[PDB]
Design a protein around this ligand. Structure first.
Ligand code: HEM
Length: 148
């Protein structure tokens, strides 16, 4: 694939600072859909404001976990079928925590925002389309967790 390289190459830059970059993704996510904030329940407590999430080690660890699932996708960008069962179960888990499947569209936009901001002029149309396809494929596999 030509897309596989666009994804690989762009991901190298991000993977140098995945927390800083995932922090943009999540700051953007809560700016777009603050109703996701309460889903991050650590010590039975809700974050009141998005900046609260940034002070939580568990939340920042979830940022790193997200970035690693993306890294797993990138590693398998040629054959995602190898992540299908893991991603189905990841879907099922997020269903269980309360995340609606539709919120994963917002996450995709936040991922694309983060890549735009980091890559600036290197975030070409082809690069955007490539990520959109990969992210879509990830979410398609996760959606199996919502049993459909
Ligand atoms: C709607 C946005 C999302 C919310 C509200 C959310 C929320 C959560 C929560 C509450 C957990 C369990 C607590 C934790 O381990 O931190 C979790 C686990 C996790 N999330 Fe997310 N998540 C979201 C998106 C994502 C995405 C996009 C990925 C990766 C693509 C991801 C990867 C993970 C992983 C790897 C775990 C560990 C699951 C396990 O095996 O127990 N999350 N998420």
């Amino acid at each position: 694939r030509p897309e596989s390289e666009l994804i690989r190459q762009s991901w190298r830059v991000v993977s140098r600072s995945p927390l800083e970059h995932g922090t943009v993704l999540f700051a953007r996510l809560f700016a777009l859909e603050p109703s996701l904030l309460p889903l991050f329940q650590y010590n039975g407590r809700q974050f009141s404001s998005p900046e609260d999430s940034l002070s939580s080690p568990e939340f920042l660890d979830h940022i790193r976990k997200v970035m690693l699932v993306i890294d797993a996708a990138v590693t398998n960008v040629e054959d995602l079928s190898s992540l299908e069962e893991y991603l189905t179960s990841l879907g099922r888990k997020h269903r269980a925590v309360g995340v609606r499947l539709s919120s994963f569209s917002t996450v995709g936009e936040s991922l694309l925002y983060m890549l735009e901001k980091s890559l600036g002029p290197d975030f070409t149309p082809a690069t955007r389309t490539a990520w959109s396809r990969l992210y879509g494929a990830v979410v398609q596999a996760m959606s199996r967790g919502w049993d459909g």
